[PDB]
Amino acid sequence: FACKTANGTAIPIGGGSANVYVNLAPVVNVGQNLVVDLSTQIFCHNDYPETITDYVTLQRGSAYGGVLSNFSGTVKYSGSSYPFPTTSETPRVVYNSRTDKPWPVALYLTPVSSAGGVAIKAGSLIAVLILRQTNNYNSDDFQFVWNIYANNDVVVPT
Ligand SMILES: OC[C@H]1O[C@H](OCC#Cc2ccc(-c3ccccc3)cc2)[C@@H](O)[C@@H](O)[C@@H]1O
C-alpha cells in the first residue's frame, strides 16, 4: 500500500509524510464554503490485492494558519461529515486494487463572521490530514501524513 499526488510526490509502503499544494477558490463569500477537495489530488493503491485487503481511515485532521483563524469547518470522508478538527477515527475505506483510487477527503470551510480580506495566504500551511492504513494480513499500522499548503490567496469580500 502506497500513495501519491499525481505530480509524482509519493509516500511509500510503511507510511511517511508528504506536502500537497492545493489551488483554492480565490474568492469565498461569507455564508458559503471553501471546498478543499483532496480526493482530486491524493491517490492510493493496494500492492497485493489478490492476497491482502487494505483498510484506510482518516485518523486525524486539523487546521492551521488562516484556515484555523478565519474559517470554521467540517470534513467529509467517504460520503459522511465529521467535525474539524477531527475527534473520532472515521469508518474504513477498502482498497483492493493496484489501480490508484482517490483518498475520499474534502474540507468544507466557511468564513467566520469577522473574516474579510485576505483570509488564507499563498504558501501557508492550512491543514494536516493523516491517513491510517491497516490490512487483513498482519499487524501493519502505518500513518500517511499529508501536509496541506495553499497555492494561492483566498479573499473574503466586503
Ligand atoms: O497493499 C498490500 C500490502 O503491501 C505492503 O506489504 C507488502 C506485502 C506482502 C505480502 C504478500 C503476500 C504474502 C504471503 C505470505 C505467505 C503466503 C502467501 C502470501 C506476504 C506478504 C504493505 O504496504 C502492507 O501494509 C499492505 O497491506
**Structure solved via:** X-ray
DSSP per-residue string spanning the chain: -EEE-TTS-EE-TT-EEEEEEE---SB--TTS-EEEEGGGT-EEE-S-TTT--EEEEEEEEEE-HHHHHHEEEEEEETTEEEEES--SPPPPEEE--SS-EE--EEEEEEE-TT--EEEE-TT-EEEEEEEEEEESSS---EEEEEEEEESS-EEE--
Q: Is 65 exposed, middle or buried (0-12, 13-18, 19+ CB in 10 A)?
A: middle
This PDB structure is determined at a resolution in Å of 1.4
CA of 44 to the centre of ligand 1 (A): 15
Q: Tell me the domains of the chain and their CATH numbers.
A: 1-158 (2.60.40.1090)
Q: 104, 78 in Cβ contact below 8 A? A: yes
C-alpha cell at 102: 482517490
C-alpha cell at 149: 499548503
Residues in the chain: 158
Short-list 34, 54, 45, 12, CA closest to 127: 34
The per-residue b/e assignment along 126-156, b for 16 or more CB within 10 angstroms, e otherwise, is bbbbbbbbbbeeeeeebebbbbbbbeebbeb
The CA-CA-CA angle for residues 43, 57, 67, to 5°, reads: 75
Q: What is the CA radius of gyration of the chain?
A: 16
Rounded-to-integer distance, Cα 116 and Cα 39, Å: 28
Q: Is ligand 1 within 6 A of the CB of residue 41?
A: no
CA of 52 to the centre of ligand 1 (A): 6
Distance of CA 77 to the CA centre of its chain: 9
Atom 18, ligand 1: which residue's CA is nearest? 51
User: What atom in ligand 1 is closest to the CA of residue 1?
Assistant: 1
How many Cα neighbours within 13 Å face the side chain of 58?
30
Q: Is ligand 1 within 6 A of the CB of residue 141?
A: no
